[PDB]
């Protein structure tokens, strides 16, 4: 993509699309779909320890940002563009998992209900690191609790997955630029 002509497209977005338009490997797309479907199943049943063990690499960066609204024509104001809703290493994810599982987490009784919808899966091997798999996917995440609370999250995920212990592919980076600036879901206490 020429971002001087396609005026609304960011350099980052143009780079990411180049990644998937080039070598299409049908089998890799299927592998990626299975990996993500299984990850989502574990998360939906609140098997957070199993998720860490089976899905998350020791060197993970798990990051969800919220970008400040700036003018499309802005070129002078150069202060921190975004904040980190999540920016977690494995240890920090483990803290969040222990928080979910703690029997004095009062907000988890009665038990929450999660349902995840994963779509638009794309997969490509990294050119330079032949063991790094780029996976892009979109998620709709439905969280229901306490009779009449219903929160629905929508996001695109830019992931890198790599083979780890036992040759199991695990998440080493997830990046989400959350599309809604002001959350209308009470919080973002869900694993996208």
């Amino acid at each position: 993509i020429n971002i001087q002509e396609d005026k609304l497209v960011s350099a980052h977005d143009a780079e990411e699309i180049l990644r998937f338009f080039n070598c299409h490997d049908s089998a890799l797309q299927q592998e990626a779909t299975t990996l993500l479907t299984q990850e989502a199943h574990l998360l939906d049943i609140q098997a957070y320890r199993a998720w860490l063990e089976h899905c998350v690499g020791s060197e993970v960066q798990y990051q969800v940002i919220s970008r400040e609204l700036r003018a499309a024509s802005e070129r002078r104001y150069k202060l921190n563009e975004a904040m980190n809703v999540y920016n977690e290493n494995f240890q920090q994810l483990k803290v969040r998992v222990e928080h979910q599982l703690d029997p004095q987490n009062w907000g988890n009784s009665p038990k929450l209900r999660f349902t995840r919808f994963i779509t638009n899966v794309q997969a490509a091997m990294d050119v330079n690191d032949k063991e790094l798999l780029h996976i892009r996917s979109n998620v709709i995440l439905h969280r229901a609790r306490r009779g009449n609370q219903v929160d629905v999250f929508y996001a695109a995920r830019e992931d890198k997955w790599k083979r780890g212990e036992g040759g199991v592919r695990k998440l080493v980076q997830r990046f989400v630029d959350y599309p809604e600036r002001i959350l209308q879901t009470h919080n973002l206490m869900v694993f996208l």
Partner: protein, 446 residues
């Protein structure tokens, strides 16, 4: 409801009618008597440091543009075009010499002046009095060590006087540390609670921490971890509570400089704060140097709260009686290493941001307490804030304000609600002052 006569808060702030968290007519009344009258947080110098820099902010339900002027001052204006009322600025931050309306193209300066009108000569000729068509300006804009507050009421006390006895507690961290920076942009999340629910919680509520935050305490292994599940009560002399004439208050938990931060930050922070304290002993005395590196949970009346040392900075922006838009920034000491500032900012959001696991512990408490204020059998019920009543002092030789010399109590609730009731029942600042001429005596009764 007759706000001159209705007892919404009982004498000495000992109780409040539950309807205050639910009644929409009262919410509308607070727009006038709370939000249009008092000082409200806008931004920090660090977010608009250069001429032309601006941000948008809420003041109550109104939106304002807050702009750094060429002369280095800051002015704030309603984000509303003077022609047909369109919102002028649709972004959160930027740099500009002015703002052009997308409806009919009127151009306003960073100083609020109407500078241009399309085809003025051909359309209006000499008839348009542009000098009278500047954006509606926030009457008062003042700084507390870089933290910028605004007030629509010209009659308000200066911001320093408004902080009253609370200023003494804030100054070690806000002034004597070398100064703070606010790290933006803020997280922004809507909760289904009244603004007063989190405001009262941050002003005065140490009692909830062990139980509400049992899971976060157990899981993070922060410095206050011993409290988890009410397993332990802090020792005698572990802290104090204070409140002030104009409603601001805080708790002080001695020495807790790492605050809510997980064990990953505890050693570096405890080293950094202790080193600065050692230097400050000589400059401001031992007690105030210790206050610098002590955890303060504070509300600057009405709706700005913070946890010093943890570095959490909050605005509880009102939307309606059971809706609040929560803005969360990080505060850092300017002379911290940049890498530590970055890690501290992420940790603030990790704990108290949109996906803050500590903040999440508070959601149901705040939301249900607020929503119950609408329920018929609870409207006229009394919320209790009597813990510690009859043990507070005023005029202490060491710690100023109305002070409870215990780490856990409801001193700061009583001061917050005394000020609230005085405003709600008053038509202007003169009347508030008359209603507050015995404020500390009321709070220290037995």
């Amino acid at each position: 409801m007759n706000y001159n006569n209705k007892i919404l808060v009982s004498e000495s702030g000992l109780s409040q009618k539950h309807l205050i968290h639910g009644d929409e007519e009262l919410f509308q009344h607070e727009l006038k008597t709370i939000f249009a009258r008092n000082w409200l947080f806008l931004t920090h110098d660090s977010l608009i440091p250069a001429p032309g820099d601006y941000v948008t902010a809420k003041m109550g339900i109104d939106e304002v543009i807050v702009s750094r002027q060429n002369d280095g001052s800051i002015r704030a204006f309603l984000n509303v075009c003077r022609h047909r009322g369109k919102t002028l600025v649709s972004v959160e931050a930027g740099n500009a010499k002015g703002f052009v309306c997308s409806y009919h193209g009127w151009g306003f300066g960073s100083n609020g002046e109407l500078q241009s009108v399309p085809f003025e000569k051909d359309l209006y000729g000499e008839s348009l009095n542009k000098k009278c068509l500047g954006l509606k300006e926030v009457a008062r804009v003042e700084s507390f060590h870089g933290f910028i507050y605004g007030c629509f009421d010209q009659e308000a006390p200066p911001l320093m006087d408004y902080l009253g006895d609370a200023a003494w507690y804030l100054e070690p961290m806000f002034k004597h540390s070398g100064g703070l920076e606010l790290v933006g942009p803020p997280g922004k999340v809507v909760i289904k609670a009244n603004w007063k629910a989190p405001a009262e919680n941050f002003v005065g509520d140490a009692y909830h921490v062990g139980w509400t935050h049992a899971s976060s305490l157990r899981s993070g292994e922060s410095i206050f971890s011993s409290l988890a599940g009410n397993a332990a009560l802090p020792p005698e002399g572990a802290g104090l509570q204070m409140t002030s004439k104009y409603g601001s208050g805080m708790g002080v938990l001695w020495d807790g400089y790492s605050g809510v931060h997980s064990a990953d930050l505890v050693p570096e922070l405890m080293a950094f704060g202790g080193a600065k304290q050692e230097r400050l002993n000589k400059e401001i005395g031992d007690v105030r140097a210790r206050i610098y590196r002590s955890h303060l949970n504070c509300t600057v009346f009405p709706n700005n709260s913070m946890l010093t040392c943890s570095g959490v900075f909050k605005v509880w922006n009102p939307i309606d009686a059971n809706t609040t838009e929560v803005w969360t920034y990080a505060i850092v000491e300017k002379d911290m290493p940049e890498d530590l500032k970055r890690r501290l900012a992420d940790s603030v959001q990790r704990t108290f941001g949109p996906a803050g696991f500590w903040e999440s512990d508070d959601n149901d408490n705040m939301e249900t307490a607020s929503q119950n204020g609408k329920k018929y059998q609870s409207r006229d019920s009394d919320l209790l804030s009597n813990l510690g009543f009859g043990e507070d002092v005023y005029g202490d030789a060491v710690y100023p304000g109305v002070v409870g010399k215990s780490a856990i109590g409801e001193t700061s609730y009583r001061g917050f609600y005394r000020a609230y009731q005085a405003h709600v029942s008053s038509s202007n600042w003169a009347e508030f002052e008359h209603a507050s001429s015995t404020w500390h005596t009321e709070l220290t009764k037995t």
